[PDB]
Design a protein around this ligand. Structure first.
Ligand SMILES: CCCCCC(=O)N[C@@H](CCO)C(=O)O
Ligand SMILES: [Zn+2]
Ligand SMILES: [Zn+2]
Length: 294
């Protein structure tokens, strides 16, 4: 029952470690893709030799070691964990690190499966030496969030879970205020990191490019939640998108860019280790997972 694990890669002179928090087992395929066709969805799963009665979403986290810094990109379910999640720290330890080694956390967005790990059940910081970065748009959205904000979300069907989650997120944002930093979209951070917004999934979802010399890796976080469904059908959307239309536009924008530039991406929820390339297959895309020897 040990779902912890890691994979070391190199990006130029940088050492990167892919970590897992575990996974999400989603059995509601009707709601998975709000603008999709569930019959067609299930057929796509079967055609790729996947189970057709659930989708498993990974929780892949990126650890970047630079000469001066140790950066964690997202933190998993943490205080929201169930039996299948909350394995980040075990994975970090397997990779050879501990929580106090982390100098900076970059939050792609404030959803529970990304921000849950920044605090423990005593509401103390899990990574006591770490600055925690978030986009100001993302931070301010959740501070001010209310039901009307989800008018173009499938989530509006579910007020029960919104009234549970939103206060919890606000409380986490309150707790991390002493370490809280906001991304600067105009500057390179720590020589290797550049940030841009990809709104829709949440209003301030942030996509991070890691660069070393001419080598680049783009962490697209929750831009897309299924390799075999939402690449060919980006307009089918995802249950957790705050605004389905805006999320679809961001999804098409960055997938198109990855394809056009033949650039490698790292993803939060695609199958392990979440690394791969994107091709245009009009009017959609295809994910080509990276191949490894171990
Ligand atoms: C108040 C927002 C709650 C939605 C959280 C969410 O969609 N989390 C996961 C999906 C978990 O089902 C994700 O976006 O990847
Ligand atoms: Zn999310
Ligand atoms: Zn997520």
């Amino acid at each position: 029952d040990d779902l912890s694990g890691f994979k070391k890669i190199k990006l130029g002179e940088l050492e990167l470690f892919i970590l897992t928090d575990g996974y999400i087992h989603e059995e509601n395929l009707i709601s998975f893709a709000p603008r999709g066709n569930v019959a067609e969805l299930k057929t796509i799963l079967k055609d790729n030799f996947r189970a057709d009665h659930y989708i498993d979403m990974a929780i892949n986290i990126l650890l970047v070691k630079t000469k001066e810094k140790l950066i964690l990109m997202d933190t998993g379910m943490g205080i929201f964990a169930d039996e299948r999640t909350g394995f980040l720290l075990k994975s970090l330890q397997k990779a050879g690190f501990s929580a106090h080694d982390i100098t900076d956390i970059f939050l792609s967005h404030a959803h529970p499966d990304h921000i849950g790990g920044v605090v423990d059940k005593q509401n103390k910081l899990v990574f006591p030496n770490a600055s925690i970065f978030i986009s100001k748009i993302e931070h301010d959205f959740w501070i001010n969030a209310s039901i009307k904000d989800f008018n173009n979300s499938a989530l509006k069907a579910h007020p029960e879970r919104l009234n549970q989650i939103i206060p919890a997120l606000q409380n986490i944002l309150k707790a991390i205020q002493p370490k809280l930093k906001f991304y600067d979209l105009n500057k390179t951070l720590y020589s290797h990191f550049n940030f841009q917004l990809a709104p829709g999934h949440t209003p301030g979802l942030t996509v991070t490019t890691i660069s070393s010399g001419n080598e680049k890796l783009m962490y697209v976080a929750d831009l897309i939640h299924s390799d075999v469904i939402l690449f060919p059908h980006p307009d089918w959307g995802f249950s957790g998108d705050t605004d389905l239309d805006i999320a679809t536009a961001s999804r098409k924008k960055f997938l198109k860019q990855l394809a056009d530039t033949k650039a490698r991406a790292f993803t939060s929820h695609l199958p392990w280790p979440g690394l791969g390339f994107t091709k245009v297959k009009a009017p959609g895309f295809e994910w080509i997972p990276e191949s490894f020897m171990n």
